[PDB]
Amino acid sequence: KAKVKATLGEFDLRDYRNVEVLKRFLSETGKILPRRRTGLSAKEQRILAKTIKRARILGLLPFTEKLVRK
């Protein structure tokens, strides 16, 4: 299982209104994925965070979800 960045086109890292993309940086739970998974860079990740959070405020993205099985 490789990085999220690895499979995707050129995408605005700043767009909080685009869920079809941003969804892919969250885990099963609402959590924002670690760099190891996101495949982003320092600056990159740092921007993605803010973007996601903005989106969550708007209710387009989960603050948290519930874990299935386990």
Binding site: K66, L67, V68, R69, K70
Partner: protein, 116 residues
């Protein structure tokens, strides 16, 4: 006296004790059980075995109401919450699904000295 037959089973398990509650699909209780509900009194209520028996009790009391299938919601980390799962599966109640709901704060409240 109800006739539910499909519903929700919540397992709330702490290090001290394990309690099970079986409810109707919109969340209202049907029956419940726990370590103290069966024999045990002290620390004995936290053992995996007590969890087993509490799950089993709850399931018996459920199949009296007519419960057939159940969606499981697990909350907490405790000795044999997984035992309450394992018990609740072989109970004869067919389990539809299992979810871990353990509530977690986004860091609101100062915890007790034993928790820092």
């Amino acid at each position: 006296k109800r006739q539910v037959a499909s519903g929700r089973a919540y397992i709330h398990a702490s290090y001290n004790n394990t309690i099970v509650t079986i409810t109707d699909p919109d969340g209202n209780p049907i029956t419940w059980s726990s370590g103290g509900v069966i024999g045990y009194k002290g620390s004995r209520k936290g053992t995996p075995y007590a969890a087993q028996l509490a799950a089993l009790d709850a399931a018996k009391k459920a199949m009296a109401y007519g419960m057939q299938s159940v969606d499981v919601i697990v909350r907490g980390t405790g000795a044999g919450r997984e035992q309450a799962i394992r018990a609740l599966q072989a109970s004869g109640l067919q389990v539809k699904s299992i979810v871990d709901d353990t509530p977690v704060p986004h860091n609101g409240c100062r915890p007790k000295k034993k928790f820092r």
